[PDB]
């Protein structure tokens with residue numbers, strides 16, 4: 001029993017973290033095979049960040065202007081290339097700790113673990129969801145850029161996020177490992193706003209199934225609803241519309257508990273309209289939306305890596 | 306910015322997990338140097354767990370009755386010993402991945418990371434507090450026993466917990482690495498209850514300082530209080546009494562924010578007496594008590610390992 005926000009074990013990713021310095025700017029890099037990936041703004045001075053021309057700035061940089069350190073050991077840089085918002089530094093040594101890996105661009109609503117680093121050294125690990133507005137609710141300070149987000153499927157690490165910036169609301173933005181931002185964000189120090197932050201309905205439903213499996217079931221009411229009637233309610237509370245694809249992904253949890261997805265929708269509708277009346281669900285006084293159906297199954301079944 | 310429940314990077318601990326089987330019972334073991342530590346109930350059948358005489362049961366076991374596996378490789382068991390509620394298996398190979406480590410018995414209110422394992426393989430990592438009633442609010446299924454709790458201080462791993470059981474309220478109980486239970490618990494399948502679950506006042510205060518540092522400061526009121534007047538309020542809400550030692554540990558956060566601890570106590574008093582009126586603090590609709598002052602400083606300063 002019990003249900004906690006759980007991150008993947010970080011060991012495979014810890015062995016890939018390096019420190020990248022260009023001039024006076026230092027941040028984290030990810031060393032896989034003979035390439036180090038890092039945010040391209042490592043080449044900026046604080047002034048350049050206000051309105052950078054990355055192509056012009058990078059032209060003043062040679063391989064010897066990038067200092068890459070793994071622990072106390074220096075890596076020799078033998079090439080450099082800019083791919084979208086990431087810089088790729090070719091080094092003369094393949095990382096001996098390179099895990100089996102792939103680069104994935106995740107969909108909004110999916111979750112991943114973040115290994116927060118400073119100066120190439122891991123500080124901690126936490127779980128994040130890619131929100132529908134393509135921001136994450138992270139915890140990052142100066143020097144955190146280059147910290148990565150990932151998922152594990154037994155022995156394969158799927159890297160999906162690299163940290164680049166913080167928006168005025170305190171939420172975070174970054175790119176996939178090809179350097180393409182999630183969302184409309186640009187790597188420039190100018191006012192940018194994320195857009196309306198909607199709730200991931202299929203994740204709230206998965207978390208209510210997690211609650212039932214854990215014996216927390218006071219909220220189960222005597223009503224049912226339809227997809228269109230539920231969505232009329234959900235859109236009023238800034239919830240994402242629920243589709244048959246979402247009902248299908250909830251299939252294993254609905255089958256395990258015997259509770260039809262539309263019956264759970266009707267319980268969610270009552271919780272939205274009436275609130276929780278001072279009660280809690282899985283130790284929370286709010287409806288939690290950062291657990292995917294996969295996270296609930298995995299945790300309630302003990303999937304290992 | 307941002308404040309999340311953050312676990313330590315788990316790599317150093319992942320390299321210590323092994324699988325221990327005795328008869329038909331399998332659980333996790335911790336391999337450090339040439340010793341594997343695991344819960345002594347690995348020697349029980351399901352029936353034995355109802356009222357076990359561990360001394361008599363262990364006498365029917367020889368070294369060859371313990372199967373220890375690290376990945377696909379078998380470790381040779383050359384000795385065994387029971388120390389309190391843990392079994393210590395001497396193996397013929399020192400773990401080549403043994404980190405710098407120590408065994409610590411933590412105090413109630415302190416936090417640690419849990420690397421949840423099944424069959425000697427890591428499943429995930431989460432942060433826990435040792436509650437004042439000596440239980441933890443974890444997430445564990447059958448086969449999780451032997452999963453450990455730890456903290457890291459740069460390169461040294463301090464192991465503080467080994468998982469043994471779940472209580473009727475859904476909370477968890479276990480021992481330090483010397484096999485002594487935290488709390489009054491015994492490793493027997495009989496009705497046991499944890500006792501009143503009080504709130505860790507110094508941790509709630511540290512989390513309110515984390516909120517202020519993050520710009521969430523709607524709750525700061527115009528009052529102050531005394532330690533005795535605050536404690537009269539706190540004891541009514543099942544909060545632990547606050548002492549000058551706690552005020553001293555809060556010193557760095559009070560100095561950073563300029564907010565005196567007794568002023569923060571008066572804001573906490575109003576939150577207890579009035580509730581949050583539907584508002585949130587750091588994304589929570591409840592007062593969070595599983596962040597120590599050290600966790601807040603470390604996260605707000607970027608301490609690395």
Ligand SMILES: *C(=N)[C@H](C[C@@H]1CCNC1=O)NC(=O)[C@@H]1[C@@H]2[C@H](CN1C(=O)[C@@H](NC(=O)C(F)(F)F)C(C)(C)C)C2(C)C
Pocket residue numbers: 027041049140141142143144145146164165166167168172186187188189190191192306
């Ligand atoms: C990389 N190490 C930091 C991480 C930031 C620092 C504070 N918390 C974080 O997540 N990245 C930056 O400092 C990036 C970097 C320039 C400016 N910047 C920002 O995150 C700024 N944000 C914005 O300008 C905004 F609002 F548009 F998103 C900052 C004001 C410092 C938070 C570049 C090149 C984007």
Ligand SMILES: *C(=N)[C@H](C[C@@H]1CCNC1=O)NC(=O)[C@@H]1[C@@H]2[C@H](CN1C(=O)[C@@H](NC(=O)C(F)(F)F)C(C)(C)C)C2(C)C
Pocket residue numbers: 001332346354445446447448449450451469470471472473477491492493494495496497
């Ligand atoms: C070890 N792998 C499991 C972990 C348990 C299983 C469910 N969630 C967990 O944390 N440990 C046990 O099964 C231990 C073990 C016998 C019984 N047991 C329990 O946790 C039981 N609890 C109690 O009897 C109680 F309430 F007193 F704490 C159980 C009913 C299975 C939850 C021994 C030797 C204590």
